[PDB]
């Protein structure tokens, strides 16, 4: 009986195996835009993805992860709220069964159709596994998706999904450029939080961009053809793989912009 997103194993049950689910800095949260104070001390955010090297894409039974070779100093996030440098290891999405839901963070309670998470580890800790033992081990860049015009840079992801339909399937996925997934503006909100799937560890400086990207209805429909089940098991469509907003517990959300 493993964790998932269903009635008997979903977010409301996670705390039994992962008591930190009720911790002091859980994610996602609702971003109340009126009360996220502008912080002029935030230096500009630096997203440097030139020469990033993707390796593989994996259906892990919850979402799909595009994994990067993080053995060298390339694909880094720095500046903004961050001290030091954080190295990209993977990205993935959360999405809905319907366009009206799917994101994890919300903006004045608004849910977007999906949300992209680019996961990075603080290089001072040597690798991801040691970084997740630290309260400043991770930085996740979150990007909202709305349904409208297609995002051309997403298409190469969409087109490999048929080859990883079910849990445990993976495929070679080299030379994918995540710069094609980024909106124009780097204006953001930031706050201290956690991973949003088990083990829910409280390592993350969250950086959530204000500007969504647009993807087409057809692109998100192909996300919704993935399966949570493994091959040869009854088909359960991979949809609504988002955790709802969690209590803020007096954390402050800061805005990079006026
Ligand atoms: Zn995520």
PDB file of N, CA, C and O and ligand atoms in Angstrom, residues 92 94 104 117 196, ligand 1:
ATOM      1  N   UNK A  92      10.034  18.100 -13.341  1.00  0.00           N
ATOM      2  CA  UNK A  92       8.800  17.333 -13.490  1.00  0.00           C
ATOM      3  C   UNK A  92       7.638  18.308 -13.403  1.00  0.00           C
ATOM      4  O   UNK A  92       7.815  19.499 -13.126  1.00  0.00           O
ATOM      5  N   UNK A  94       3.226  18.763 -12.263  1.00  0.00           N
ATOM      6  CA  UNK A  94       1.984  18.324 -11.623  1.00  0.00           C
ATOM      7  C   UNK A  94       0.859  18.879 -12.463  1.00  0.00           C
ATOM      8  O   UNK A  94       0.971  20.021 -12.951  1.00  0.00           O
ATOM      9  N   UNK A 104       0.121  23.183  -7.787  1.00  0.00           N
ATOM     10  CA  UNK A 104       0.322  22.946  -6.361  1.00  0.00           C
ATOM     11  C   UNK A 104       0.258  24.266  -5.600  1.00  0.00           C
ATOM     12  O   UNK A 104      -0.622  24.474  -4.740  1.00  0.00           O
ATOM     13  N   UNK A 117       8.225  22.062 -11.932  1.00  0.00           N
ATOM     14  CA  UNK A 117       9.215  22.183 -10.854  1.00  0.00           C
ATOM     15  C   UNK A 117      10.583  21.780 -11.375  1.00  0.00           C
ATOM     16  O   UNK A 117      10.777  20.629 -11.810  1.00  0.00           O
ATOM     17  N   UNK A 196       7.190  18.418  -2.217  1.00  0.00           N
ATOM     18  CA  UNK A 196       5.733  18.253  -2.193  1.00  0.00           C
ATOM     19  C   UNK A 196       5.288  16.825  -2.424  1.00  0.00           C
ATOM     20  O   UNK A 196       4.085  16.584  -2.443  1.00  0.00           O
TER      21      UNK A 196
HETATM   22 ZN1  LIG B   1       6.931  18.912  -7.831  1.00  0.00          ZN
END
